[PDB]
Amino acid sequence: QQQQIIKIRITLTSTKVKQLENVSSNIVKNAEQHNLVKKGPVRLPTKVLKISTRKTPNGEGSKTWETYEMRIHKRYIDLEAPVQIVKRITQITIEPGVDVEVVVASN
Amino acid sequence: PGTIVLYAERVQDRGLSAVAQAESMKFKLLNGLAIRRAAYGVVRYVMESGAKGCEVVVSGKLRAARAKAMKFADGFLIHS
Amino acid sequence: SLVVQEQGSFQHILRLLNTNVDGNIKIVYALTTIKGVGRRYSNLVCKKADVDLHKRAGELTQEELERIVQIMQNPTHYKIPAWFLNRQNDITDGKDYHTLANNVESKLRDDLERLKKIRAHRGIRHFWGLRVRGQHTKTTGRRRA
């Protein structure tokens, strides 16, 4: 509270690569702009969600299967900053379809 | 209360919205205007709006018990 | 690697539990010819009978054959854990038995007759000759059942 570091961590998850990468780049830019030393955006392996279904609504015809996929892209950045700036960064740099989580790491 | 908020904003270039065109044609059909007239009016509106191409398919029973499909097109239309 | 040399004392086809137990076959797999004793039961009976497991059923002597028979008759009195047995907690008297050569078929007849006499579904299925464990009868078991 008295201008001390909180050991913060931010997680970015989205189905949109471009929007998510824009958010991550913006947060990085505000990081070294306010002169922050940090662990850069670590990219988790992309999660592919699959559902395989018979195309036919009935059960007639050649048995043709069809696989739909969602792609979940996640990144995390470990930051250390005072309250007046962690709030400032959190209230900006948000896009639709990109979910942001902020946690206080104590390890 | 207050964590859900709901705005409404105008659709620009509404002639390029397939959902809006399909709804408008549907209501024209409910009002009873001719199927060929309504389809071609939709196609002309879409093309006048600046679309590269338009395509309207009307399937079902038309004036007869046996069902058929009428097809209206203008401009260019890719498929694959 | 003991190349033991034997005289004409090899016991050929012999009789245990009213059955013909032939030589030239290890004692464990030779006792399996007796009804009601399989590979696991025979191996347990043999190791509790303290007999070597490479005796071809022919160089077994009289007293150890008798000991094997006695252990087969009375598994419980030689520390066999009673979940290893053929008949545990029977309908008649509730003590753990083990049916042997001539009595497996007799007891099977008796229990099937019990089911028939009480007119239970599995018993009447046995009487009709159909399958009793809920198998489908549309396509399988046709030629003989």
Partner: protein, 141 residues
């Protein structure tokens, strides 16, 4: 620091990373000596880079190999490819490269997979069959 290089060898899905630094002739796989690589019918497949170039120039060098993924055969091939690529890599970095060229010629004149990972890859299964090409049995009438 000690002069070292790190390389890898890749079969279908097995990868073997090899550390190659100056030593006394120490060749180990998963902390165990190269002489104990299993299966022993294919243990010579791992021996091949030794037996071709020669153990003479393995005196100054030692290799430590860690291999994961794949199966037994695939791991063996990953180990042999990683050993050869580590040898050529250390000779490139800390030795004159005419010797590297004899190593390259010796390995490639015998088998292409001493330096180059096999490009064969699994073909995904398609519906309507147990495999990538094979289909379910068809019936008429």
């Amino acid at each position: 620091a000690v002069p070292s290089v790190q390389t890898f060898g890749k079969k279908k899905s097995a990868t073997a990373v090899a550390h190659v630094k100056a030593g006394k002739g120490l060749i180990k796989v998963n902390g165990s000596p190269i002489t104990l690589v299993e299966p022993e019918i294919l243990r010579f497949k791992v021996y091949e880079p030794l037996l071709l170039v020669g153990l003479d120039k393995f005196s100054n060098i030692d290799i430590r190999v860690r291999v994961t993924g794949g199966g037994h055969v695939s791991q063996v091939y990953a180990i042999r490819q990683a050993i050869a690529k580590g040898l050529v890599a250390y000779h490139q970095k800390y030795v004159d490269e005419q010797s590297k060229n004899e190593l390259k010629k010796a390995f490639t004149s015998y088998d292409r997979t001493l330096l180059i990972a096999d490009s064969r890859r699994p073909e995904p299964k398609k519906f309507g069959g147990k495999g990538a090409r094979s289909r379910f049995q068809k019936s008429y009438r």
